[PDB]
Amino acid sequence: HWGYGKHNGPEHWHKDFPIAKGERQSPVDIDTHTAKYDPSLKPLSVSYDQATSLRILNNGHSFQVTFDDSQDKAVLKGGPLDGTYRLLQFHFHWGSLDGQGSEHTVDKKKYAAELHLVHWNTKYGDVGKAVQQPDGLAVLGIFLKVGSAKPGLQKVVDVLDSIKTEGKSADFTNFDPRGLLPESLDYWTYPGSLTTPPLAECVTWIVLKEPISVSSEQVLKFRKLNFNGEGEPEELMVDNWRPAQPLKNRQIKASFK
Numbered sequence: 001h002w003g004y005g006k007h008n009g010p011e012h013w014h015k016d017f018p019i020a021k022g023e024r025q026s027p028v029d030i031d032t033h034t035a036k037y038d039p040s041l042k043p044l045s046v047s048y049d050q051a052t053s054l055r056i057l058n059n060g061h062s063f064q065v066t067f068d069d070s071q072d073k074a075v076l077k078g079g080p081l082d083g084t085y086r087l088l089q090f091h092f093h094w095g096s097l098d099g100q101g102s103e104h105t106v107d108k109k110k111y112a113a114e115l116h117l118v119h120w121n122t123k124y125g126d127v128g129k130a131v132q133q134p135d136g137l138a139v140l141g142i143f144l145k146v147g148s149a150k151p152g153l154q155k156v157v158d159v160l161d162s163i164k165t166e167g168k169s170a171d172f173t174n175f176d177p178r179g180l181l182p183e184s185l186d187y188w189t190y191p192g193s194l195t196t197p198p199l200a201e202c203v204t205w206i207v208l209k210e211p212i213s214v215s216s217e218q219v220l221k222f223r224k225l226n227f228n229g230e231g232e233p234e235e236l237m238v239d240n241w242r243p244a245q246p247l248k249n250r251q252i253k254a255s256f257k
């Protein structure tokens with residue numbers, strides 16, 4: 001029932017998911033002059049060399065690439081994190097126009113899209129248990145701006161025609177998510193939530209300062225996806241982002257000066 005339309009979008013979600021008005025909701029605006037450099041934060045460790053992608057799917061709210069998370073093959077460690085977090089999937093949020101689409105903002109700036117690499121804390125054994133814990137998930141958020149093409153994204157873009165409508169999936173093996181990362185791993189971090197229902201407050205957010213650049217043709221292909229299913233009235237999948245939420249009693253920490 002929930003979505004991004006006028007009658008079921010973010011301003012409605014609290015009725016089914018009252019945690020939408022909770023104390024650690026995401027996304028947030030990152031005020032760069034208020035975030036504090038924390039020298040105790042460790043460098044991020046992104047170990048994706050053994051990643052095993054499985055499928056790509058249109059779930060009616062975004063498209064997602066899934067990974068085999070039954071072993072420590074693609075893990076995130078370090079930074080603000082204690083322990084080992086396994087990569088489960090990645091997906092994007094994007095706009096109808098290049099000036100909007102990201103969920104997090106930086107000094108109120110909206111990027112054209114935002115990539116979420118979703119990882120779960122192995123001490124909880126499975127992702128369903130992890131989402132019930134305040135430190136269960138670590139999502140690596142990466143901004144996209146429009147400029148030069150991102151070669152490591154092209155394989156994703158070229159298969160989207162095969163998952164145009166909700167419920168469609170396709171084989172997506174041998175995809176290397178390292179090709180979606182910027183050069184720098186400098187980041188901001190804060191405790192937050194999933195950005196769609198059920199809005200569970202289980203996420204350590206790690207948002208990279210350096211955006212990746214994608215081409216206008218690449219983001220245009222995101223915008224040709226459909227929220228609807230096959231044989232239904234076509235509604236383009238655009239503006240699948242939640243706006244910034246109240247920071248409340250949180251501090252955003254920076255890994256860099």
Ligand SMILES: Cc1cc(C)c2c(c1)S(=O)(=O)NC(=O)N2
Nearest residue numbers: 002003004005006008227228235
């Ligand atoms: C009619 C309509 C318009 C928009 C933007 C929608 C939906 C329907 S929707 O498909 O019900 N789900 C969604 O996310 N956005």
Ligand SMILES: Cc1cc(C)c2c(c1)S(=O)(=O)NC(=O)N2
Nearest residue numbers: 059088089118127128131197198
């Ligand atoms: C535990 C869990 C719950 C929900 C609603 C999820 C996922 C995991 S998920 O697999 O990360 N992808 C998704 O779209 N919804």
Ligand SMILES: Cc1cc(C)c2c(c1)S(=O)(=O)NC(=O)N2
Nearest residue numbers: 116118139193194195196197198
């Ligand atoms: C685990 C998970 C589940 C869902 C539905 C999510 C996310 C993570 S997410 O990365 O916060 N972004 C989003 O829109 N939905």
Ligand SMILES: [Zn+2]
Nearest residue numbers: 091093116195
């Ligand atoms: Zn997301």
